[PDB]
């Protein structure tokens, strides 16, 4: 990045580590977790660090396990101001076939609803934990291979580990 | 009935977060969903917005 | 003391709806079948909502009311149909 380092040093990217030997950083190739992101109006980010935009108004899929069916997430988009080029996120739905085949719903506040029933946070069921983070943002956590973030005013995140 | 407790003056209405507020920033609870005081809002076929506490839908 | 026996929690049961099991807890909280719940809770018949934002009030039908069991001041209201 335009600065020098002596040999034998080991700087660490978020993903993995790299070490200087004979003017050649050696590096590992071990996978590291991805992050799909929704924010702003309609600005997406793929797991592969792509950016793009799609201002559609319907219930779209966002992610899904596709060789088995451990989960499936569904965004719901609406126009969100007077302009036509302003399509923010209202609510996202989550689905776990591994537990009752239930149906979680993050709502436009900091609220959540399991099968129509509003719920106080925290919600320790067997696997999934749902709790506030700063007392202004929800955080789902199914297992150890899944996280989420608030869909109140539309800043949905995910965290998928390399098992997927 | 005419009950006893902790209220606040008539110009102020109760917010979720312990304070009470005028009806300018009093949100809407449409379909459960807590919309902020200014949230223009529509599918393809309906048209809806939250003005001052009430949820003004049309078609 | 031994002569101090307050109320902790009361349980309610409605065979007319799922044969469910409501539970008023030592706070102002409620739990249907183990699941904590945000107030209000409009199901078909029974309504549960705060009263002063410091006390729960169940209301099944029009022939039944309740009051808070947090620190133990349970009430009821039964109409003459019973």
XYZ file of C-alpha atoms in Angstrom:
305
model
C 0.000 0.000 0.000
C 2.886 2.342 -0.733
C 4.898 1.656 2.415
C 7.792 -0.637 3.252
C 8.039 -3.490 5.750
C 11.123 -5.483 6.843
C 11.465 -9.202 6.099
C 9.970 -11.769 8.427
C 7.026 -9.519 9.298
C 3.493 -10.924 9.258
C 0.706 -8.497 8.437
C -2.807 -9.920 8.557
C -5.675 -9.144 6.261
C -9.127 -9.762 7.686
C -9.154 -12.993 5.676
C -5.738 -14.481 6.508
C -2.036 -13.729 7.090
C 0.942 -13.067 4.834
C 4.690 -13.034 5.550
C 7.593 -11.326 3.770
C 10.417 -13.542 2.491
C 12.776 -12.518 -0.334
C 10.596 -9.588 -1.475
C 7.671 -12.017 -1.881
C 4.765 -12.093 0.544
C 3.721 -15.704 1.020
C 0.011 -16.166 1.695
C -2.581 -18.785 2.575
C -5.717 -19.435 0.514
C -8.107 -20.478 3.285
C -11.685 -19.284 2.874
C -13.109 -16.474 4.994
C -16.686 -15.385 5.645
C -18.771 -13.406 3.203
C -21.147 -10.522 3.748
C -24.168 -9.757 1.628
C -25.426 -6.267 2.423
C -28.496 -4.157 1.770
C -28.591 -0.488 2.721
C -29.572 2.998 1.642
C -32.303 2.869 -0.933
C -31.532 -0.105 -3.145
C -27.772 -0.609 -3.007
C -26.746 -4.248 -2.704
C -23.478 -6.039 -2.091
C -22.890 -9.641 -3.046
C -20.930 -12.160 -1.035
C -18.168 -11.873 -3.649
C -17.714 -8.136 -2.906
C -19.717 -7.042 -5.953
C -21.774 -3.873 -5.836
C -24.896 -3.130 -7.877
C -28.410 -1.697 -7.645
C -31.903 -2.958 -8.488
C -34.912 -0.789 -7.633
C -37.631 -3.403 -7.883
C -40.829 -3.340 -5.832
C -41.894 -6.853 -4.832
C -40.894 -9.660 -2.463
C -37.453 -10.726 -3.679
C -35.242 -13.539 -2.463
C -31.952 -12.434 -0.916
C -30.239 -15.682 0.047
C -30.969 -19.382 0.290
C -29.162 -22.634 0.915
C -29.519 -24.411 -2.393
C -28.112 -27.966 -2.158
C -29.877 -28.543 1.128
C -32.428 -26.147 2.607
C -31.066 -25.104 5.989
C -32.565 -21.614 5.571
C -33.960 -19.028 3.168
C -34.176 -15.229 3.432
C -36.668 -13.023 1.598
C -36.485 -9.246 1.321
C -39.512 -7.058 0.597
C -39.008 -3.787 -1.269
C -41.282 -0.759 -1.537
C -41.077 2.724 -2.911
C -39.998 4.901 -0.039
C -40.350 8.562 -1.076
C -41.970 10.703 -3.751
C -39.431 9.880 -6.474
C -39.590 6.653 -8.441
C -35.835 6.113 -7.959
C -36.160 5.569 -4.203
C -36.963 1.981 -3.224
C -36.009 1.221 0.384
C -36.392 -1.980 2.357
C -39.441 -2.405 4.593
C -39.251 -5.912 6.022
C -37.251 -9.105 5.627
C -38.493 -12.627 6.295
C -36.421 -15.536 7.590
C -37.282 -19.222 7.471
C -35.763 -22.180 9.329
C -36.952 -25.634 8.167
C -34.819 -27.064 10.999
C -37.049 -25.669 13.783
C -40.828 -26.130 13.344
C -40.396 -24.804 9.790
C -41.145 -21.522 11.542
C -41.267 -18.057 9.961
C -39.479 -15.100 11.522
C -40.207 -11.561 10.358
C -38.087 -8.490 11.005
C -40.331 -5.444 10.888
C -39.878 -1.787 10.008
C -39.169 -0.886 13.615
C -36.740 -2.828 15.755
C -39.453 -5.454 16.182
C -39.656 -9.134 15.357
C -42.555 -11.550 14.927
C -42.485 -15.348 15.037
C -45.520 -16.809 13.253
C -47.494 -13.595 13.691
C -46.703 -13.265 17.407
C -44.733 -10.252 18.576
C -41.834 -11.132 20.866
C -39.751 -9.475 23.569
C -36.005 -9.648 23.164
C -34.029 -11.844 23.969
C -35.467 -15.020 22.412
C -33.221 -17.974 23.346
C -34.811 -20.923 21.646
C -32.545 -23.951 21.086
C -30.406 -22.711 18.186
C -31.269 -19.149 17.183
C -30.576 -16.182 19.440
C -32.184 -12.797 18.834
C -31.119 -9.852 20.960
C -30.565 -6.148 20.728
C -27.036 -4.931 20.021
C -26.989 -1.254 21.029
C -30.655 -1.394 22.141
C -31.360 0.126 18.699
C -30.693 -2.837 16.387
C -31.670 -6.496 16.337
C -29.162 -9.315 15.785
C -30.317 -12.802 14.860
C -27.819 -15.622 15.363
C -28.743 -19.130 14.183
C -26.093 -21.657 15.126
C -22.564 -20.354 14.640
C -22.776 -20.097 10.824
C -25.276 -17.233 10.465
C -25.836 -13.659 11.638
C -28.097 -10.787 10.625
C -28.658 -7.115 11.445
C -31.458 -4.569 11.687
C -34.129 -4.197 9.003
C -35.908 -1.284 10.629
C -34.907 1.523 8.276
C -33.181 -0.920 5.909
C -29.550 -1.843 6.637
C -29.795 -5.613 6.388
C -26.541 -7.576 6.700
C -25.578 -11.246 6.830
C -22.579 -13.305 7.928
C -22.078 -16.712 6.305
C -19.170 -18.925 7.302
C -17.253 -20.997 4.714
C -19.331 -24.117 5.397
C -21.755 -22.636 2.830
C -63.148 4.738 33.512
C -61.442 7.812 35.006
C -58.255 6.136 36.231
C -55.289 7.235 38.370
C -51.618 7.201 37.420
C -48.830 8.956 35.530
C -50.043 10.912 32.489
C -48.722 14.003 30.704
C -50.594 17.096 29.417
C -53.065 16.798 26.521
C -50.756 18.386 23.916
C -48.371 15.476 24.544
C -49.111 11.844 23.666
C -47.166 8.794 24.769
C -44.159 7.420 22.868
C -42.782 3.897 23.141
C -39.513 5.120 24.691
C -40.814 6.471 28.008
C -41.117 10.079 26.951
C -44.399 11.471 25.598
C -44.465 13.662 22.508
C -46.764 15.883 20.444
C -48.697 14.306 17.604
C -46.127 15.638 15.071
C -43.671 12.744 15.613
C -46.242 10.212 16.814
C -45.635 7.106 14.655
C -48.126 4.826 12.940
C -48.696 1.147 13.762
C -50.053 -0.077 10.413
C -50.300 -3.878 10.355
C -48.127 -3.836 13.473
C -45.377 -2.053 11.578
C -43.988 0.957 13.429
C -43.546 3.559 10.693
C -41.725 6.800 11.383
C -43.631 10.108 11.195
C -42.814 10.600 7.478
C -42.797 7.321 5.525
C -44.363 7.413 2.035
C -45.276 3.919 1.262
C -46.813 1.897 -1.556
C -47.054 -1.391 -3.370
C -48.001 -1.338 -7.080
C -51.752 -1.007 -6.484
C -52.215 0.778 -3.144
C -50.831 4.101 -1.934
C -50.318 4.903 1.726
C -48.529 7.262 4.087
C -48.189 8.128 7.776
C -48.877 11.798 8.502
C -49.209 12.518 12.241
C -50.121 9.206 13.903
C -52.844 8.046 11.534
C -52.143 5.841 8.519
C -53.678 7.488 5.387
C -54.169 4.693 2.856
C -55.813 5.023 -0.550
C -56.077 2.832 -3.658
C -40.298 -14.188 58.402
C -42.430 -17.292 58.043
C -45.617 -15.182 58.150
C -44.890 -13.497 54.812
C -46.104 -15.465 51.789
C -46.545 -13.261 48.714
C -47.664 -14.186 45.225
C -45.024 -14.874 42.573
C -46.888 -15.966 39.454
C -50.383 -16.904 38.340
C -51.277 -19.264 35.506
C -54.317 -19.014 33.242
C -55.768 -21.711 31.013
C -58.281 -21.476 28.160
C -59.557 -24.833 26.817
C -61.478 -22.795 24.215
C -58.333 -21.640 22.360
C -55.691 -24.322 21.634
C -56.013 -25.374 25.290
C -53.176 -22.879 25.657
C -51.423 -21.862 28.884
C -50.824 -18.219 29.752
C -48.462 -17.262 32.564
C -48.251 -13.896 34.287
C -44.751 -13.480 35.670
C -43.199 -11.615 38.578
C -42.495 -8.589 36.416
C -45.089 -7.082 34.123
C -44.353 -9.904 31.687
C -46.470 -12.632 30.158
C -45.644 -15.937 28.478
C -47.851 -18.035 26.205
C -46.652 -21.652 26.114
C -43.154 -20.660 27.214
C -42.821 -17.856 24.652
C -42.416 -14.304 25.899
C -44.743 -11.829 24.204
C -44.883 -8.107 23.482
C -48.038 -6.305 24.499
C -50.696 -5.981 23.012
C -51.696 -9.547 22.089
C -54.975 -9.434 20.118
C -55.756 -13.040 19.406
C -59.404 -13.825 18.573
C -60.992 -13.574 22.028
C -58.476 -12.585 24.698
C -56.859 -9.158 24.792
C -53.772 -8.467 26.890
C -52.488 -4.918 27.153
C -50.855 -2.589 29.601
C -53.102 -0.281 31.613
C -50.825 2.463 32.964
C -47.766 0.937 31.228
C -47.052 -0.588 34.665
C -49.758 -3.268 34.907
C -51.090 -5.976 32.617
C -54.808 -6.499 31.950
C -56.080 -9.716 30.409
C -59.571 -9.631 28.908
C -61.093 -12.879 27.606
C -64.445 -12.281 25.962
C -66.599 -9.795 27.851
C -67.077 -11.986 30.955
C -63.529 -11.964 32.368
C -60.793 -9.528 33.397
C -57.567 -9.746 35.381
C -54.849 -7.460 36.746
C -51.121 -7.442 37.436
C -49.347 -10.313 39.194
C -45.930 -8.696 39.227
C -45.606 -7.867 42.918
C -48.864 -9.674 43.730
C -52.123 -7.714 43.395
C -54.138 -10.182 41.351
C -57.778 -9.281 40.660
C -60.615 -10.781 38.635
C -63.946 -9.625 37.214
C -66.631 -12.256 36.621
C -69.997 -11.299 35.172
C -73.243 -12.911 36.413
C -73.238 -15.506 33.623
C -71.000 -17.525 35.986
